Amino acid sequence: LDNGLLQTPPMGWLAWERFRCNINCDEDPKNCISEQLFMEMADRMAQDGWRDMGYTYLNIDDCWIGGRDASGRLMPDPKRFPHGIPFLADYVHSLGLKLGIYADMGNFTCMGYPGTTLDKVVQDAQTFAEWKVDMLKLDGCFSTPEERAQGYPKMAAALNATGRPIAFSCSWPAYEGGLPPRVQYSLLADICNLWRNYDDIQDSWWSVLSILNWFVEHQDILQPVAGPGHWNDPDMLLIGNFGLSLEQSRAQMALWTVLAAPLLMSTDLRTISAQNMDILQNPLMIKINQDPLGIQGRRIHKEKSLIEVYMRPLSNKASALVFFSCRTDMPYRYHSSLGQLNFTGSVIYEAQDVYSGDIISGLRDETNFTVIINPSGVVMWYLYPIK
Amino acid sequence: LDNGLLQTPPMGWLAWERFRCNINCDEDPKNCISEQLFMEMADRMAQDGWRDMGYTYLNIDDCWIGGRDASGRLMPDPKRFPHGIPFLADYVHSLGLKLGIYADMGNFTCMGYPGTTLDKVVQDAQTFAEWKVDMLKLDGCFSTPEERAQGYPKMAAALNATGRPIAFSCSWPAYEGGLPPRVQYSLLADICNLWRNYDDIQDSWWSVLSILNWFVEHQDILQPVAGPGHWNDPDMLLIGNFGLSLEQSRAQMALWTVLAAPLLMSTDLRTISAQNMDILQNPLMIKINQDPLGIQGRRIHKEKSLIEVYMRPLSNKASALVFFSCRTDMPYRYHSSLGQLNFTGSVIYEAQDVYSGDIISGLRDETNFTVIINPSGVVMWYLYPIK
Ligand SMILES: *[C@@H]1O[C@H](CO)[C@@H](O[C@@H]2O[C@H](CO)[C@@H](O[C@@H]3O[C@H](CO[C@H]4O[C@H](CO)[C@@H](O)[C@H](O)[C@@H]4O)[C@@H](O)[C@H](O[C@H]4O[C@H](CO)[C@@H](O)[C@H](O)[C@@H]4O)[C@@H]3O)[C@H](O)[C@H]2NC(C)=O)[C@H](O)[C@H]1NC(C)=O
Ligand SMILES: *[C@@H]1O[C@H](CO)[C@@H](O[C@@H]2O[C@H](CO)[C@@H](O[C@@H]3O[C@H](CO[C@H]4O[C@H](CO)[C@@H](O)[C@H](O)[C@@H]4O)[C@@H](O)[C@H](O[C@H]4O[C@H](CO)[C@@H](O)[C@H](O)[C@@H]4O)[C@@H]3O)[C@H](O)[C@H]2NC(C)=O)[C@H](O)[C@H]1NC(C)=O
Ligand SMILES: *[C@@H]1O[C@H](CO[C@@H]2O[C@@H](C)[C@@H](O)[C@@H](O)[C@@H]2O)[C@@H](O[C@@H]2O[C@H](CO)[C@@H](O)[C@H](O)[C@H]2NC(C)=O)[C@H](O)[C@H]1NC(C)=O
Ligand SMILES: *[C@@H]1O[C@H](CO)[C@@H](O[C@@H]2O[C@H](CO)[C@@H](O)[C@H](O)[C@H]2NC(C)=O)[C@H](O)[C@H]1NC(C)=O
Ligand SMILES: *[C@@H]1O[C@H](CO)[C@@H](O)[C@H](O)[C@H]1NC(C)=O
Numbered sequence: 119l120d121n122g123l124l125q126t127p128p129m130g131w132l133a134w135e136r137f138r139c140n141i142n143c144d145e146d147p148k149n150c151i152s153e154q155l156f157m158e159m160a161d162r163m164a165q166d167g168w169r170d171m172g173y174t175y176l177n178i179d180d181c182w183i184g185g186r187d188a189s190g191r192l193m194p195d196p197k198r199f200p201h202g203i204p205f206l207a208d209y210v211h212s213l214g215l216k217l218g219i220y221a222d223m224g225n226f227t228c229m230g231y232p233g234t235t236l237d238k239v240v241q242d243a244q245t246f247a248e249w250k251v252d253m254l255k256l257d258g259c260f261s262t263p264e265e266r267a268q269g270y271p272k273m274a275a276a277l278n279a280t281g282r283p284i285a286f287s288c289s290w291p292a293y294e295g296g297l298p299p300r301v302q303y304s305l306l307a308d309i310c311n312l313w314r315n316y317d318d319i320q321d322s323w324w325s326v327l328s329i330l331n332w333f334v335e336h337q338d339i340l341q342p343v344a345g346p347g348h349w350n351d352p353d354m355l356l357i358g359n360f361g362l363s364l365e366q367s368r369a370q371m372a373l374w375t376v377l378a379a380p381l382l383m384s385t386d387l388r389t390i391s392a393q394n395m396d397i398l399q400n401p402l403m404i405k406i407n408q409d410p411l412g413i414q415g416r417r418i419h420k421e422k423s424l425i426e427v428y429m430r431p432l433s434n435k436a437s438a439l440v441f442f443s444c445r446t447d448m449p450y451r452y453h454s455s456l457g458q459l460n461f462t463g464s465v466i467y468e469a470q471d472v473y474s475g476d477i478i479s480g481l482r483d484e485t486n487f488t489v490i491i492n493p494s495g496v497v498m499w500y501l502y503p504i505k
Numbered sequence: 506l507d508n509g510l511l512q513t514p515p516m517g518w519l520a521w522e523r524f525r526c527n528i529n530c531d532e533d534p535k536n537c538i539s540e541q542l543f544m545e546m547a548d549r550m551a552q553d554g555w556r557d558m559g560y561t562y563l564n565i566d567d568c569w570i571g572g573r574d575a576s577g578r579l580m581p582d583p584k585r586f587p588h589g590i591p592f593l594a595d596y597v598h599s600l601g602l603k604l605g606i607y608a609d610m611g612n613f614t615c616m617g618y619p620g621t622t623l624d625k626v627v628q629d630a631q632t633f634a635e636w637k638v639d640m641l642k643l644d645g646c647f648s649t650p651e652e653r654a655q656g657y658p659k660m661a662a663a664l665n666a667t668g669r670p671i672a673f674s675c676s677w678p679a680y681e682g683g684l685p686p687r688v689q690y691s692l693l694a695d696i697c698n699l700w701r702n703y704d705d706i707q708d709s710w711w712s713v714l715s716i717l718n719w720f721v722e723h724q725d726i727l728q729p730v731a732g733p734g735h736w737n738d739p740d741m742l743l744i745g746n747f748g749l750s751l752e753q754s755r756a757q758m759a760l761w762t763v764l765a766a767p768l769l770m771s772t773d774l775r776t777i778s779a780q781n782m783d784i785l786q787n788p789l790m791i792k793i794n795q796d797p798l799g800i801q802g803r804r805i806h807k808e809k810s811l812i813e814v815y816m817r818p819l820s821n822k823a824s825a826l827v828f829f830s831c832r833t834d835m836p837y838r839y840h841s842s843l844g845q846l847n848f849t850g851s852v853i854y855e856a857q858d859v860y861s862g863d864i865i866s867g868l869r870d871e872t873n874f875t876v877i878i879n880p881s882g883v884v885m886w887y888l889y890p891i892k
């Protein structure tokens with residue numbers, strides 16, 4: 119989408135994965151979907167380094183809507199958002215952050231909240247711009263394929279017409295099977311800043327693997343369509359939550375990074391461990407994700423040993439390599455060479471291990487190297503020519 | 506098996522899951538299958554509280570064998586076990602531990618090492634007794650159903666004839682589908698102290714879940730056959746390794762405990778975190794697993810919320826309850842009562858949370874309670890009547 123926004127993948131925090139549709143503030147005031155939740159996350163993002171590392175978006179997801187007023191305008195739940203959305207945007211903006219919001223192209227949101235139908239698209243867009251929203255995620259429940267075909271372009275146009283730059287996240291392809299000919303990716307690139315290709319991420323390693331598998335199986339189609347202003351979205355980071363081990367958390371970060379994916383957290387930033395914070399705030403990892411070229415990486419190698427190699431091209435002749443173990447036994451000594459991974463010859467390379475910080479020097483194409491990869495884990499290299 | 510052994514489930518450490526068939530001691534001296542690995546693990550069990558908590562078995566698995574000597578007598582690999590097995594048994598015994606060993610009823614072990622064929626059963630049993638081995642795991646690769654049908658009873662009798670009490674771990678059912686009509690559990694209880702029912706555990710939550718699911722699907726068959734001296738074996742604990750999150754780790758421990766499973770670790774005790782040690786060395790958890798009645802627990806309730814309730818009966822009218830979330834979203838507030846869980850009425854109960862140590866007192870059948878269960882996690886209660 120040519121709106122000047124998201125020249126690199128979006129970074130921030132989204133409420134949905136960790137906090138879902140929890141509206142019981144009387145019993146659970148600390149974790150319910152409320153202005154307090156978002157204000158507290160904003161505080162954390164300002165104070166705990168998140169903003170300084172580039173995590174700038176703070177995104178409301180489903181279950182925020184109170185209803186529609188007399189003139190049909192969307193309003194937040196008065197009991198859970200008493201100061202209103204403009205106050206929340208003001209608060210978020212004052213902390214150097216951006217506010218995202220959520221709507222659904224259809225009769226209702228997935229959770230049954232007032233939906234944005236075709237006749238409400240223009241009005242809701244205007245409402246969001248007036249509230250000074252910076253991002254919108256448009257879900258696609260309770261609609262027909264026809265209504266989506268009309269509606270998603272209609273919202274992209276409506277947001278445009280408001281004059282306010284608003285990042286546009288599109289669930290449309292997820293509800294169509296994510297593949298051509300039903301899905302038209304050239305059109306999605308033109309109308310959206312990012313799109314959810316596939317199934318909702320869940321707090322499990324299985325969920326991560328199934329998303330990876332789908333992106334890899336269809337990478338010939340998916341890889342070329344990503345770039346500055348228009349990204350594939352394999353969904354939220356799980357790091358900080360319940361279902362991923364340490365190795366798996368490091369794997370998701372590394373793999374989302376080489377896929378030029380959004381880095382959208384969804385976790386309790388108030389209680390996140392230092393170890394998980396270290397994964398998410400890794401400066402080299404972020405720099406790689408935010409590479410100005412915006413070229414989505416690919417799986418370039420698979421072996422019977424269940425070691426996979428992913429590669430992403432980066433600016434200044436650099437590369438990201440992710441050696442990924444699908445094994446479930448023990449650390450694996452993976453032997454390879456840059457030549458066997460199709461790198462340019464008569465150039466001496468050097469690598470920095472993204473997690474350990476170690477530097478491997480003197481790698482020619484023919485040089486045999488060994489990486490030790492933990493089960494359901496990764497080794498990640500930032501690779502560059504030295505001479 | 507009526508040899509006076511394993512009146513409670515065995516507790517200890519087994520090499521296989523974490524260290525597998527790594528025989529490359531030249532490149533990987535610290536982690537290869539060698540006498541040094543076993544000696545170092547024995548040292549850790551003696552010094553770090555494991556033995557004192559009841560973890561007494563230190564068990565060799567596959568890939569220890571060097572061949573057979575001129576008398577047809579089994580030999581360890583001379584390069585990896587230069588001192589021999591009697592040396593290791595003596596070392597282990599001097600630390601108050603017991604030594605387990607591994608053989609295969611068939612032409613070869615699963616990894617291709619010399620097998621204990623029918624004509625070698627007596628000789629190998631005698632060898633193990635002479636070495637002063639305390640436990641034998643008899644794997645079932647490279648044999649026919651009829652060879653196993655003769656071989657397992659033959660081994661039990663052969664071990665008996667040595668005059669040395671040797672705990673007998675039988676993989677027989679795992680190679681027969683683990684179910685009637687092919688598996689006779691009344692026969693197994695007579696000839697074996699424990700038996701591997703089902704698939705090898707791998708370092709993943711999916712693996713834990715598939716094992717749990719199979720055990721629960723078949724609990725009407727499996728539950729009644731377990732008792733003092735004859736246990737079901739759902740395989741090794743993964744706690745300390747790579748694939749399980751903290752919640753999943755606590756889950757496996759609690760669920761193995763309610764299933765009256767062996768508590769056989771397979772992890773690097775030299776590098777184990779304080780957190781994982783705290784799970785495995787939980788005194789109340791161990792007490793429950795080691796309950797003298799040896800009654801295997803059951804899943805007694807399942808809900809569309811994906812909360813499962815497991816119950817194990819214990820001595821002196823006590824019980825263990827495991828509230829288990831198969832959910833993959835967020836913490837779940839599970840509302841229930843002891844009456845809804847079919848506990849005896851007009852009795853006042855008290856519960857201790859096994860992980861937190863909190864005491865919930867004065868629970869009647871009618872008393873509503875709430876437990877907050879994390880995704881892929883548990884809450885575990887030790888429950889008993891009070892005056
Ligand atoms: C509604 O939709 C319209 C499009 O239909 C949007 O209009 C586009 O707005 C974007 C962002 O403001 C414009 O992109 C910018 O173009 C600047 C100039 O480019 C001119 O020259 C090139 C020749 O190469 C022409 O192709 C082009 O038509 C322009 O005439 C650039 O200077 C900007 O670059 C910025 O980013 C780069 C990063 O690579 C930095 O290095 C620069 O410093 C700079 O910051 C940028 O690329 C685009 O020109 C507009 N398109 C059209 C067709 O008009 C509206 O923004 C949108 N409205 C809303 C509110 O959503
Ligand atoms: C090789 O195989 C043989 C035969 O299977 C084994 O011999 C058995 O050993 C077990 C375990 O020691 C014996 O079981 C115990 O018997 C005690 C008393 O038994 C007497 O009476 C019976 C007949 O009723 C005779 O067989 C026996 O000779 C004795 O005279 C019990 O007191 C024990 O009770 C235990 O369990 C109860 C639970 O009910 C607990 O409350 C107690 O605390 C206690 O721990 C126990 O049942 C069994 O009797 C032996 N059978 C035979 C036929 O002799 C060998 O042990 C085995 N050897 C090796 C090296 O593996
Ligand atoms: C999305 O909703 C439309 C709009 O109708 C709504 O639901 C009706 C049951 C009623 O409560 C209206 O007031 C709502 O506005 C659905 O379109 C209707 O479809 C039915 C046949 O299924 C038809 O009889 C009605 O005439 C349609 N409504 C009008 C007046 O346009 C539509 O079914 C919903 N989309 C899906 C497929 O989920
Ligand atoms: C176990 O080993 C025996 C003895 O070697 C095997 O019997 C041989 O099988 C091979 C290959 O099938 C034949 O070529 C020979 O004719 C057999 N030799 C003898 C001495 O019988 C037997 O197949 C093996 N059993 C299993 C179940 O793997
Ligand atoms: C690297 O190892 C491969 C395979 O083991 C071998 O063919 C080759 O000779 C080695 N190359 C170098 C430069 O040592």
Ligand SMILES: *[C@@H]1O[C@H](CO)[C@@H](O)[C@H](O)[C@H]1NC(C)=O
Pocket residue numbers: 871872873
């Ligand atoms: C538990 O709570 C429910 C609320 O619906 C109530 O019906 C029930 O009587 C309560 N149990 C008691 C006896 O406290």
Ligand SMILES: *[C@@H]1O[C@H](CO)[C@H](O)[C@H](O)C1(F)F
Pocket residue numbers: 134179180227228229257258289314318
């Ligand atoms: C749409 O459905 C839910 C909200 O109910 C959530 O936003 C999810 O990420 C979705 F799939 F986009």
Ligand SMILES: *[C@@H]1O[C@H](CO)[C@H](O)[C@H](O)C1(F)F
Pocket residue numbers: 521566567614615616644645676701705
């Ligand atoms: C048999 O196979 C392997 C050894 O090769 C291991 O012992 C496993 O636990 C088994 F299933 F028992």
